[PDB]
């Protein structure tokens, strides 16, 4: 029974040695022979107003035209981007929401927050209104993220320090993923929806297999809480944003860090991270009211999206990659192009 | 230059906007309080006088109060404490009889120091609600106050032992230029607690109005 604190250290050292052996070059060394992106001039096209409190979440539809936003005023608003019209305004039982999602088929939406319950709302009903299709309970902490799989399974993460894959038809936890030692702040779904990564407050990220139900790999390197995560469009890498004013790129196959995006004049944490359609750009929302655009091959800042009067809380990019939506704490969403 | 079907979507959006404005106007006139404590310190009693979040709604003198209680949130406070940034006041509950603790008084002091000097509550008032004023007499007649605060030197009566914990709790305040701590000793089977909360809320609202007008 004395093997504790000694066997694990030796296996960790073996893993470190393997990672060091597999490292021969860096992304910068290979990429230094690539033409720089250059200055990126993105400007606002539509300003979506109507929320009366801080906006905490936002998600794009799969048709790249409709989006959903959630704020602390207990409202879930569905916007039509092209004409800035309001399609639906769902009132919430609990006005402490911290996340929202849009179903891939466009039939349902999901919400959750400090009430530890994930609510599923049905948008296409014969009665002509929006009804609460389901209320999933079982988490012991505030929900922080939720993502639909197809139309009947949803993945959620909470401050309980566990993740859960549900089954909306019966409302039961089909699978539970454990292993984090701190609150789980976000998750991202792989394009093939067979794996997903989760970033926790113990300065770690973990890659879970949805079908098997067990952790595959663990990634470390940050010095503080991770509160944003996103997959590369390829599906073999991801990016993390933390509270130490640093973004990082991790790779699944090499099981190693690739490059860190940081600057001397940035000292505030990152709230949201997203990629572009081609994966060349990397957009990160910051606490100093701004949103930076990084050339995610040389770690060179290549643009700034200024125009918000408070902290930028949510960030998203359409599937066709023709616009970027940023929602901030001043109750405003902006569509940059 | 809009089609017939496109001109009705605009009307629907305008109706949605009007309903949203009405809801916001209705909601902005409600007082919001955040209830905090060290656990089993009298919060249940205070709620009686008037999973996750627990909301209690009540009415006093045609004024609507919503009080938010966090008891099941046994997680990192710093990840969700910024949600309650616009609350009118923080009602802090402390037990006067927990000075012996077989200890918990120091934990309560640490919690009060962390909450009062937070970067989000720079200008949010705290209403102190020292409870259990009845058991204090017996507990101070049996055991002395010297067990807690060893630097204390005074009579063991309910005139020096009390009104000394209040200064100990108030001295933890660092921003004595934009906040104000209202301290009250909870009564027994009386409505004076709601009156005290009402007076503190009125003062906070007057100050907020004077800030808003620009004076």
């Amino acid at each position, epitope marked *: 029974l004395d093997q504790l604190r000694q066997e694990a250290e030796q296996l960790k050292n073996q893993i470190r040695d393997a990672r060091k052996a597999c490292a021969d070059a860096t992304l910068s060394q290979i990429t230094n022979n690539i033409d720089p992106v250059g200055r990126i001039q993105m400007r606002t096209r539509r300003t979506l107003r109507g929320h009366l409190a801080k906006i905490y979440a936002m998600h794009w539809g799969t048709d790249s035209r409709l989006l959903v936003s959630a704020s602390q005023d207990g409202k879930l608003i569905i916007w039509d981007s092209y004409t800035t019209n309001k399609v639906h305004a769902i009132p919430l039982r609990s006005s402490w929401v911290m996340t929202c999602a849009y179903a891939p088929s466009g039939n349902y939406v999901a919400c959750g927050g400090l009430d530890n319950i994930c609510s599923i709302y049905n948008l296409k009903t014969r*009665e*002509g209104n929006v009804r609460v299709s389901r209320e999933l309970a079982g988490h012991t902490g505030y929900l922080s993220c939720c993502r639909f799989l197809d139309d009947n399974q949803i993945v959620t993460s909470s401050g309980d320090t566990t993740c859960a894959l549900w089954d909306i038809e019966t409302g039961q936890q089909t699978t539970t993923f454990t292993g984090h030692t701190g609150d789980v702040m976000s998750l991202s779904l792989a394009p093939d929806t067979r794996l997903f990564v989760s970033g926790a407050c113990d300065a770690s990220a973990k890659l879970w297999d949805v079908r098997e139900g067990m952790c595959r790999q663990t990634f470390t390197g940050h010095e503080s809480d991770i509160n944003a995560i996103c997959f590369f469009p390829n599906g073999n890498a991801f990016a993390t944003g933390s509270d130490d004013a640093t973004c990082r790129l991790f790779d699944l196959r090499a099981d190693q860090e690739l490059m860190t995006y940081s600057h001397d004049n940035i000292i505030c944490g990152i709230t949201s991270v997203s990629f572009s359609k081609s994966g060349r750009l990397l957009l990160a929302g910051y606490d100093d009211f701004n949103c930076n655009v990084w050339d995610a091959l040389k770690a060179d800042r290549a643009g700034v999206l200024a125009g918000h009067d408070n902290r930028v809380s949510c960030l998203g990019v359409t599937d066709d990659g023709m616009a970027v939506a940023t929602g901030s704490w001043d109750s405003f969403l902006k569509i940059w192009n | 230059t809009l089609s017939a079907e496109d001109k009705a979507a605009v009307e629907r959006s305008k109706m949605i906007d009007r309903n949203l404005r009405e809801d916001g106007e209705k909601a902005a006139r409600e007082v919001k309080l955040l209830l905090l404590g060290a656990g089993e310190s009298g919060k249940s009693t205070i709620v009686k006088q008037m999973t996750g979040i627990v909301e209690t709604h009540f009415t006093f003198k045609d004024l609507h109060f919503k009080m938010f209680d966090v008891g099941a949130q046994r997680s990192e406070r710093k990840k969700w404490i910024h949600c309650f940034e616009g609350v009118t006041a923080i009602i802090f509950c402390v037990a006067l009889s927990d000075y012996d603790l077989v200890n918990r008084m120091h934990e309560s002091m640490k919690l009060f120091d962390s909450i009062c000097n937070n970067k989000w509550f720079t200008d949010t008032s705290i209403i102190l609600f020292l409870n259990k004023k009845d058991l204090f007499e017996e507990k101070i007649k049996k055991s002395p106050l010297t067990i807690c605060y060893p630097e204390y030197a005074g009579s063991n009566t309910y005139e020096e032992a009390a009104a000394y914990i209040q200064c100990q709790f108030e001295d933890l305040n660092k921003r004595k230029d934009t906040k104000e701590i209202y301290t009250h000793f909870t009564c027994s089977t009386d409505t004076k607690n709601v009156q005290f909360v009402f007076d503190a809320v009125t003062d906070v609202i007057i100050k907020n109005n004077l800030k808003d007008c620009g004076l």
Partner: single-chain antibody
Amino acid sequence: DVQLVESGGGLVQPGGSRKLSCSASGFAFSSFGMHWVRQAPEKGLEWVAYISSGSGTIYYADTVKGRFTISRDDPKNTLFLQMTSLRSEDTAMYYCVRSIYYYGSSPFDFWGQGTTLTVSSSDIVMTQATSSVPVTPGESVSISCRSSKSLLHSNGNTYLYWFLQRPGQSPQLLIYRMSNLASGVPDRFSGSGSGTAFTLTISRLEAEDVGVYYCMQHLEYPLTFGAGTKLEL
């Protein structure tokens, strides 16, 4: 379930007055625009009047203006049509239709039942150059509708609707905006065509499909129907 029940029809002397009522149960009546649609005893359909949701938009069909008045009572979920100075050219059956307008919605989805009136004794035109076409169960049939002005707005939406009316039943929605299929309609129905020329195709025809097919436009608000194509045998 959704239900619209109409009442207030009967024999009327010429020049008199009448009131028709439509009671709605099973859906959010307050958020639906409502239409009154006529049909002469042996003729095709004809739009009559329209009232919006949260009444702020009212339209009449250029022949009842100044004689008909449309109103709604949301708390009791009722729709009223007051008709004055009735003449012999008003003997018809009246239908109470609902329609909700937002991005991706399906207007005209549910039709009422009908009340019979028996009064004693710029305008796009849609052409259906076909009256009757014999069919057999198992084959495929095509119905063609033709417009005078192109029904293609700059948005990219073509505003054409295809309705079916079975023998002795209220019409039901088949196709909206020239390509989309209404909920509950079997896959064998399809719709296509370009501006000024549209087609509806039925593959593997079977029973309970014989009836009259109507094409409607929704570009400029004096909505116009087609003559109607009847399938027999």
